Amino acid sequence: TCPFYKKIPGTGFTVDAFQYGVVEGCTAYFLTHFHSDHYAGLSKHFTFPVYCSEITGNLLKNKLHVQEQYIHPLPLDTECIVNGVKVVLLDANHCPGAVMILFYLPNGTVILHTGDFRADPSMERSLLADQKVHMLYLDTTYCSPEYTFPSQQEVIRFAINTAFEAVTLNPHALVVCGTYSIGKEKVFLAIADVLGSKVGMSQEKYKTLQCLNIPEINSLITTDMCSSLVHLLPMMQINFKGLQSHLKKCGGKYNQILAFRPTGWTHSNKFTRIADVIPQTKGNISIYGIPYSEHSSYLEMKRFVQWLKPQKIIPTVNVGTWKSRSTMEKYFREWKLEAGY
Ligand code: NI
Questions:
Q1: Which of 108, 167, 179, 311 sits a CA distance of 20 to 30 A from 223?
Q2: Structurally, how many domains does the chain consist of?
Q3: Which of 154, 325, 328, 184 minimizes the C-alpha distance to 264?
Protein backbone atom coordinates (compact mmCIF):
# COMPACT_ATOMS: atom_id res chain seq x y z
CA THR A 1 0.00 0.00 0.00
CA CYS A 2 1.10 3.47 -1.08
CA PRO A 3 2.58 5.63 1.73
CA PHE A 4 1.18 9.07 2.57
CA TYR A 5 4.27 11.07 1.49
CA LYS A 6 3.70 9.87 -2.13
CA LYS A 7 0.19 11.22 -2.37
CA ILE A 8 -0.71 14.81 -3.31
CA PRO A 9 -3.81 15.93 -1.21
CA GLY A 10 -6.69 17.50 -3.03
CA THR A 11 -5.79 15.78 -6.26
CA GLY A 12 -5.95 12.54 -8.07
CA PHE A 13 -2.11 12.45 -8.19
CA THR A 14 0.76 10.30 -6.87
CA VAL A 15 4.51 10.78 -7.24
CA ASP A 16 7.00 7.89 -7.80
CA ALA A 17 4.31 5.32 -6.77
CA PHE A 18 4.44 2.43 -9.34
CA GLN A 19 5.16 -0.59 -6.94
CA TYR A 20 1.83 -0.60 -5.07
CA GLY A 21 -0.47 -1.91 -7.85
CA VAL A 22 -3.54 0.19 -8.71
CA VAL A 23 -3.62 3.11 -6.24
CA GLU A 24 -7.20 3.95 -5.12
CA GLY A 25 -8.30 7.25 -6.60
CA CYS A 26 -5.16 7.86 -8.70
CA THR A 27 -5.96 9.38 -12.11
CA ALA A 28 -2.36 10.38 -13.02
CA TYR A 29 0.98 8.92 -11.88
CA PHE A 30 3.94 11.34 -12.03
CA LEU A 31 7.53 10.02 -12.38
CA THR A 32 10.27 12.50 -11.29
CA HIS A 33 13.27 10.61 -12.84
CA PHE A 34 14.42 7.27 -14.26
CA HIS A 35 16.13 5.68 -11.21
CA SER A 36 14.99 2.17 -10.18
CA ASP A 37 13.85 2.91 -6.59
CA HIS A 38 11.44 5.49 -8.16
CA TYR A 39 10.24 3.65 -11.29
CA ALA A 40 9.85 0.25 -9.50
CA GLY A 41 6.75 -1.44 -11.09
CA LEU A 42 6.53 0.16 -14.56
CA SER A 43 6.52 -2.17 -17.68
CA LYS A 44 4.83 -2.65 -21.11
CA HIS A 45 1.72 -3.77 -19.18
CA PHE A 46 1.13 -0.41 -17.44
CA THR A 47 -2.16 1.19 -18.65
CA PHE A 48 -2.57 4.48 -16.69
CA PRO A 49 -1.34 7.99 -17.70
CA VAL A 50 2.32 8.70 -16.71
CA TYR A 51 3.47 12.28 -16.59
CA CYS A 52 7.20 13.06 -16.83
CA SER A 53 9.91 14.90 -18.71
CA GLU A 54 10.73 14.21 -22.43
CA ILE A 55 13.97 12.42 -21.49
CA THR A 56 12.23 10.22 -18.84
CA GLY A 57 9.60 9.45 -21.49
CA ASN A 58 12.31 8.29 -24.03
CA LEU A 59 13.66 5.89 -21.35
CA LEU A 60 10.14 4.54 -20.46
CA LYS A 61 9.39 3.76 -24.17
CA ASN A 62 12.85 2.21 -25.13
CA LYS A 63 14.11 0.66 -21.95
CA LEU A 64 10.91 -0.47 -20.12
CA HIS A 65 8.67 -0.72 -23.32
CA VAL A 66 5.86 1.34 -21.90
CA GLN A 67 3.34 1.98 -24.71
CA GLU A 68 3.43 5.41 -26.31
CA GLN A 69 -0.30 6.02 -25.68
CA TYR A 70 0.23 6.18 -21.86
CA ILE A 71 3.41 8.37 -21.90
CA HIS A 72 2.70 12.09 -21.35
CA PRO A 73 5.87 14.17 -21.69
CA LEU A 74 5.74 17.82 -20.48
CA PRO A 75 8.08 20.68 -21.33
CA LEU A 76 10.01 22.35 -18.52
CA ASP A 77 9.37 25.84 -17.16
CA THR A 78 5.86 25.87 -18.71
CA GLU A 79 2.42 26.04 -16.98
CA CYS A 80 0.43 22.85 -18.01
CA ILE A 81 -3.12 21.80 -16.99
CA VAL A 82 -3.34 18.11 -16.02
CA ASN A 83 -6.79 16.68 -15.07
CA GLY A 84 -7.96 20.11 -14.09
CA VAL A 85 -4.89 21.17 -12.07
CA LYS A 86 -2.06 23.59 -13.01
CA VAL A 87 1.44 22.01 -12.74
CA VAL A 88 5.01 23.06 -13.70
CA LEU A 89 8.10 20.85 -14.11
CA LEU A 90 11.48 22.36 -13.10
CA ASP A 91 15.04 21.02 -13.64
CA ALA A 92 16.13 19.13 -10.41
CA ASN A 93 19.94 19.25 -11.07
CA HIS A 94 20.01 15.44 -10.48
CA CYS A 95 20.40 12.96 -13.41
CA PRO A 96 19.28 13.53 -17.03
CA GLY A 97 15.50 14.10 -17.26
CA ALA A 98 15.07 14.63 -13.49
CA VAL A 99 12.40 17.17 -12.39
CA MET A 100 10.77 18.86 -9.42
CA ILE A 101 7.00 19.37 -9.70
CA LEU A 102 5.01 22.48 -8.59
CA PHE A 103 1.29 21.75 -7.98
CA TYR A 104 -1.21 24.66 -7.78
CA LEU A 105 -4.10 23.06 -5.84
CA PRO A 106 -7.70 24.03 -6.53
CA ASN A 107 -8.06 25.37 -2.95
CA GLY A 108 -5.09 27.87 -3.32
CA THR A 109 -2.36 25.76 -1.63
CA VAL A 110 0.96 25.52 -3.57
CA ILE A 111 3.07 22.29 -3.18
CA LEU A 112 6.70 21.77 -4.37
CA HIS A 113 7.86 18.07 -4.71
CA THR A 114 11.66 18.13 -5.24
CA GLY A 115 11.96 14.48 -6.41
CA ASP A 116 15.68 13.79 -6.03
CA PHE A 117 17.67 17.09 -6.37
CA ARG A 118 20.97 18.91 -5.82
CA ALA A 119 19.94 22.31 -4.58
CA ASP A 120 21.57 25.30 -6.27
CA PRO A 121 21.34 29.17 -5.96
CA SER A 122 20.21 29.18 -9.61
CA MET A 123 16.86 27.72 -8.40
CA GLU A 124 16.18 30.98 -6.57
CA ARG A 125 15.58 32.50 -10.11
CA SER A 126 13.36 29.87 -11.59
CA LEU A 127 9.50 30.15 -11.58
CA LEU A 128 9.83 29.52 -7.75
CA ALA A 129 10.68 33.21 -7.29
CA ASP A 130 7.10 34.39 -8.15
CA GLN A 131 4.93 32.95 -5.33
CA LYS A 132 4.63 31.32 -1.98
CA VAL A 133 4.94 27.48 -1.28
CA HIS A 134 2.89 26.04 1.55
CA MET A 135 4.16 22.39 1.56
CA LEU A 136 7.68 21.07 0.49
CA TYR A 137 8.16 17.31 -0.14
CA LEU A 138 11.98 17.31 0.31
CA ASP A 139 14.87 15.02 -0.79
CA THR A 140 16.59 14.68 2.63
CA THR A 141 19.24 12.15 1.52
CA TYR A 142 22.13 14.09 3.20
CA CYS A 143 20.21 15.98 5.87
CA SER A 144 22.99 16.15 8.57
CA PRO A 145 25.98 18.49 8.93
CA GLU A 146 28.56 15.75 8.60
CA TYR A 147 27.63 15.44 4.96
CA THR A 148 30.08 17.60 3.13
CA PHE A 149 31.52 17.21 -0.42
CA PRO A 150 33.10 19.48 -3.14
CA SER A 151 31.36 21.12 -6.13
CA GLN A 152 30.88 18.86 -9.22
CA GLN A 153 33.23 21.30 -11.12
CA GLU A 154 36.14 20.66 -8.59
CA VAL A 155 35.59 16.91 -8.87
CA ILE A 156 35.65 16.91 -12.68
CA ARG A 157 38.82 19.16 -12.61
CA PHE A 158 40.51 16.46 -10.42
CA ALA A 159 39.38 13.61 -12.67
CA ILE A 160 40.50 15.24 -16.02
CA ASN A 161 43.94 16.33 -14.58
CA THR A 162 44.49 12.78 -13.07
CA ALA A 163 43.58 10.94 -16.29
CA PHE A 164 45.52 13.33 -18.59
CA GLU A 165 48.69 13.05 -16.45
CA ALA A 166 48.56 9.26 -16.28
CA VAL A 167 48.01 8.62 -20.01
CA THR A 168 50.64 11.25 -20.99
CA LEU A 169 53.20 9.47 -18.81
CA ASN A 170 52.02 6.09 -20.19
CA PRO A 171 50.27 6.09 -23.61
CA HIS A 172 49.55 2.40 -23.06
CA ALA A 173 47.30 3.05 -19.98
CA LEU A 174 43.49 2.34 -20.23
CA VAL A 175 40.99 4.44 -18.28
CA VAL A 176 37.89 2.68 -16.87
CA CYS A 177 34.83 4.37 -15.25
CA GLY A 178 32.10 2.56 -13.25
CA THR A 179 28.33 3.11 -13.80
CA TYR A 180 25.03 1.43 -12.56
CA SER A 181 22.27 3.90 -13.46
CA ILE A 182 21.92 7.10 -15.42
CA GLY A 183 23.52 10.20 -13.91
CA LYS A 184 27.14 11.37 -13.51
CA GLU A 185 27.84 11.15 -17.32
CA LYS A 186 30.12 14.27 -17.04
CA VAL A 187 32.76 12.02 -15.31
CA PHE A 188 33.43 9.76 -18.33
CA LEU A 189 32.58 12.44 -20.99
CA ALA A 190 35.03 15.00 -19.57
CA ILE A 191 37.87 12.39 -19.30
CA ALA A 192 37.26 11.12 -22.92
CA ASP A 193 37.26 14.74 -24.23
CA VAL A 194 40.67 15.56 -22.64
CA LEU A 195 42.15 12.29 -24.06
CA GLY A 196 40.76 12.68 -27.62
CA SER A 197 38.82 9.47 -27.39
CA LYS A 198 35.21 8.23 -27.65
CA VAL A 199 33.81 6.37 -24.68
CA GLY A 200 33.40 2.62 -25.29
CA MET A 201 30.61 0.62 -23.68
CA SER A 202 28.13 -2.28 -23.99
CA GLN A 203 25.23 -2.17 -26.38
CA GLU A 204 22.73 -1.88 -23.42
CA LYS A 205 24.50 1.22 -21.97
CA TYR A 206 24.86 2.84 -25.43
CA LYS A 207 21.09 2.40 -25.87
CA THR A 208 20.40 4.12 -22.56
CA LEU A 209 22.66 7.04 -23.43
CA GLN A 210 21.00 7.47 -26.86
CA CYS A 211 17.71 8.34 -24.99
CA LEU A 212 19.22 11.40 -23.15
CA ASN A 213 19.17 14.33 -25.62
CA ILE A 214 22.88 15.06 -25.08
CA PRO A 215 24.16 17.36 -27.88
CA GLU A 216 26.55 15.85 -30.40
CA ILE A 217 26.39 12.41 -28.54
CA ASN A 218 27.15 10.45 -31.73
CA SER A 219 30.51 12.31 -31.59
CA LEU A 220 31.27 11.09 -27.97
CA ILE A 221 30.28 7.40 -27.46
CA THR A 222 30.68 4.04 -29.22
CA THR A 223 30.16 0.33 -28.96
CA ASP A 224 33.49 -0.46 -30.68
CA MET A 225 35.66 -1.04 -27.64
CA CYS A 226 38.86 -1.50 -29.70
CA SER A 227 38.64 2.08 -30.99
CA SER A 228 38.33 3.74 -27.49
CA LEU A 229 40.79 4.22 -24.55
CA VAL A 230 38.07 5.16 -22.06
CA HIS A 231 35.80 2.17 -21.24
CA LEU A 232 32.62 2.03 -19.13
CA LEU A 233 31.92 -1.05 -16.97
CA PRO A 234 29.30 -1.97 -14.41
CA MET A 235 30.09 -0.52 -10.92
CA MET A 236 30.34 -4.06 -9.49
CA GLN A 237 33.33 -4.82 -11.73
CA ILE A 238 35.35 -1.83 -10.39
CA ASN A 239 37.69 -3.88 -8.13
CA PHE A 240 41.15 -5.52 -8.63
CA LYS A 241 39.74 -8.94 -9.84
CA GLY A 242 37.21 -7.45 -12.24
CA LEU A 243 39.74 -5.03 -13.73
CA GLN A 244 42.44 -7.74 -14.11
CA SER A 245 39.88 -9.79 -16.03
CA HIS A 246 38.97 -6.84 -18.26
CA LEU A 247 42.68 -6.10 -19.03
CA LYS A 248 43.10 -9.71 -20.27
CA LYS A 249 40.32 -9.09 -22.79
CA CYS A 250 42.04 -6.13 -24.45
CA GLY A 251 44.51 -8.21 -26.55
CA GLY A 252 47.75 -6.64 -25.16
CA LYS A 253 46.89 -3.11 -26.24
CA TYR A 254 47.33 -1.86 -22.64
CA ASN A 255 49.68 -2.55 -19.70
CA GLN A 256 48.04 -0.41 -16.96
CA ILE A 257 44.46 0.58 -15.82
CA LEU A 258 43.46 3.73 -14.07
CA ALA A 259 39.80 3.37 -12.79
CA PHE A 260 37.25 5.75 -11.31
CA ARG A 261 34.30 4.92 -8.91
CA PRO A 262 32.04 7.86 -8.61
CA THR A 263 30.33 7.37 -5.27
CA GLY A 264 28.14 9.68 -3.24
CA TRP A 265 29.50 10.79 0.13
CA THR A 266 31.93 8.47 1.95
CA HIS A 267 33.46 8.96 5.51
CA SER A 268 36.88 9.74 3.91
CA ASN A 269 35.16 13.18 3.10
CA LYS A 270 35.40 13.87 6.86
CA PHE A 271 39.23 13.93 6.62
CA THR A 272 40.58 14.36 3.07
CA ARG A 273 40.28 17.35 0.64
CA ILE A 274 39.59 16.52 -3.04
CA ALA A 275 43.10 17.76 -3.93
CA ASP A 276 44.71 15.24 -1.52
CA VAL A 277 42.71 12.19 -2.73
CA ILE A 278 44.84 9.11 -3.48
CA PRO A 279 43.98 5.76 -5.10
CA GLN A 280 44.09 2.15 -3.96
CA THR A 281 46.74 0.35 -6.03
CA LYS A 282 47.65 -3.35 -6.76
CA GLY A 283 50.41 -3.89 -9.34
CA ASN A 284 49.52 -2.11 -12.62
CA ILE A 285 45.88 -1.24 -11.40
CA SER A 286 44.88 1.96 -9.52
CA ILE A 287 41.27 2.79 -8.34
CA TYR A 288 40.09 6.29 -7.32
CA GLY A 289 36.89 6.86 -5.33
CA ILE A 290 35.66 10.29 -6.27
CA PRO A 291 32.76 12.07 -4.40
CA TYR A 292 30.65 13.23 -7.34
CA SER A 293 27.21 13.91 -5.77
CA GLU A 294 23.86 14.43 -7.50
CA HIS A 295 22.16 15.16 -4.17
CA SER A 296 22.26 18.37 -2.04
CA SER A 297 24.97 18.71 0.62
CA TYR A 298 23.65 19.73 4.03
CA LEU A 299 24.63 23.37 3.47
CA GLU A 300 23.03 23.48 -0.03
CA MET A 301 19.78 21.98 1.32
CA LYS A 302 19.68 24.40 4.23
CA ARG A 303 20.23 27.43 1.96
CA PHE A 304 17.41 26.39 -0.36
CA VAL A 305 14.89 25.74 2.39
CA GLN A 306 15.76 29.04 4.30
CA TRP A 307 15.20 30.91 0.97
CA LEU A 308 11.93 29.13 0.10
CA LYS A 309 10.40 29.50 3.65
CA PRO A 310 7.84 26.65 3.36
CA GLN A 311 5.10 26.40 5.96
CA LYS A 312 5.46 22.62 6.28
CA ILE A 313 8.22 20.10 5.27
CA ILE A 314 7.55 16.43 4.44
CA PRO A 315 10.77 14.38 4.04
CA THR A 316 10.91 11.79 1.28
CA VAL A 317 14.26 10.08 2.26
CA ASN A 318 15.46 8.50 5.55
CA VAL A 319 11.83 8.18 6.71
CA GLY A 320 12.03 4.59 8.07
CA THR A 321 13.67 5.14 11.54
CA TRP A 322 12.61 7.23 14.50
CA LYS A 323 16.20 8.43 15.07
CA SER A 324 16.34 9.76 11.41
CA ARG A 325 12.92 11.40 11.64
CA SER A 326 13.74 13.14 14.94
CA THR A 327 17.17 14.35 13.66
CA MET A 328 15.57 15.84 10.50
CA GLU A 329 12.76 17.56 12.48
CA LYS A 330 15.38 19.20 14.78
CA TYR A 331 17.27 20.69 11.84
CA PHE A 332 14.10 21.98 10.19
CA ARG A 333 13.22 23.86 13.47
CA GLU A 334 16.75 25.29 13.76
CA TRP A 335 16.59 26.56 10.21
CA LYS A 336 13.18 28.19 10.82
CA LEU A 337 14.31 29.89 14.10
CA GLU A 338 17.55 31.16 12.58
CA ALA A 339 15.87 32.67 9.45
CA GLY A 340 12.71 33.88 11.24
CA TYR A 341 9.84 32.32 9.15
NI1 NI B 1 17.72 9.39 -7.87
A1: 167
A2: 2
A3: 184
